[PDB]
């Protein structure tokens with residue numbers, strides 16, 4: 001008599017009907033390319049799981065980005081490699097070009113296509129209402145594609161979405177947390193960045209699905225249209241859900257815990273307390289006004305739902321009136 005089980009309401013059995021070895025990444029064997037083809041040019045960022053460089057393929061003077069892994073389980077590395085290969089060539093998915101063994105750390109190093117990114121903390125520089133619809137739609141293209149391939153990204157955030165604004169070119173990146181969906185499976189809830197974790201993770205409900213990425217996406221949407229990143233800013237995981245409740249209200253949240261019989265921490269209820277649902281209008285002011293419309297508001301609201309099963313799918317999201325114009329001028333005769 002623990003929690004109520006859940007299944008994705010779309011793309012449920014996509015993996016069930018793939019041959020093994022589509023999803024059996026443990027089985028996967030890496031074919032290594034040549035390390036000496038690539039020359040590290042400058043460091044871009046350091047993380048706990050990798051170090052990231054801009055590099056040059058000396059064989060053709062093409063720019064690339066190399067992600068050198070820190071020492072890590074074969075399994076976690078094959079998982080990321082398998083997912084990048086399964087998704088390769090999909091819309092707005094970052095293209096893995098090659099896999100080499102770094103000759104200094106003897107660690108696998110992944111080589112991706114190069115994208116001239118503008119950093120998101122500066123991007124909002126003349127970033128209009130239409131830019132947000134367009135890039136949001138581009139992200140949805142990717143999410144629909146990877147979900148339909150039985151894959152959850154589980155780390156959607158501004159930083160994992162690269163944009164070359166000049167060319168209106170976007171890629172979804174960093175698939176090191178991504179996982180294959182199997183109906184009934186109980187996943188690890190230590191995924192995603194704090195600001196973008198869905199209620200299901202915050203309340204330790206492990207049998208989640210693709211739906212998680214849609215919450216993280218609403219978070220991104222909210223921060224962009226309201227000019228406040230991150231939108232939900234808690235000091236820890238507990239407070240994170242307290243931040244969501246203050247906006248979405250505690251009524252809807254306890255309805256969610258009832259429905260799935262989730263059972264909350266002793267006085268998790270303490271810090272949650274009691275909160276009115278807010279009108280999305282209370283986050284509108286004169287410097288975000290122009291990014292905001294009833295369509296943006298309605299769309300947003302159908303993303304940030306406590307109940308994962310009741311959130312829009314990426315496909316459904318694409319069909320929203322918010323994107324009508326974006327769809328119109330992506331219809332090209334060629």
Ligand SMILES: O=C1C=C2C[C@]3(O)COc4c(ccc(O)c4O)C3=C2C=C1O
Nearest residue numbers: 044045046052065094112162173174175
């Ligand atoms: O496939 C990719 C591709 C990139 C390119 C790139 O976006 C460049 O710059 C980065 C970064 C990751 C962390 C970081 O701190 C940073 O600066 C990158 C990636 C991660 C991936 O999985």
